[PDB]
Amino acid sequence: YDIQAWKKQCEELLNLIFQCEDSEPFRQPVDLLEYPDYRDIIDTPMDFATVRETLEAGNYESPMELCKDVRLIFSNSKAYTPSKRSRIYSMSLRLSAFFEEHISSVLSDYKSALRFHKR
């Protein structure tokens, strides 16, 4: 019932994501020189370095907020892809599956800890 445990759990999951080859296109903001109309399609850019920095700054209050930003990385890939068979989008789908598989217990444990605190 540790209400703070999610933070180190999210740091460890981000470390696993960073060291996976599939995260390379998502480690830093999308290059606007390479994709000059990116901001005509994507309203809110997001990347894993921004998520890690927000976490380390103490600017997430819960793992739900972190999870919303990570999901935004993946929805941005889905929205910008011209095809469901593109290389970057295919990498995003695998990385999303890995992230969802691992974030589920982090969210459940945190919500259970908050419920116990308010019992």
Ligand X SMILES: Cc1cc(F)cc(S(N)(=O)=O)c1
The residue ranges that bind ligand X (CB under 6 A) are 16-17, 20, 30, 35, 77, 80-82, 86, 88-89, 92, 98
CB of 4 to ligand X, least distance (A): 24
CB of 117 to ligand X, least distance (A): 31
Q: In terms of CB distance, is 28 or 86 closer to ligand X?
A: 86
Q: How far is the CB of 114 from ligand X (least distance, A)?
A: 28
In Å, how far are 58, 63, 102, 116 from 80, measured between CA atoms?
30, 26, 25, 41
Nearest-angstrom CA–CA distance, 21 and 24: 6
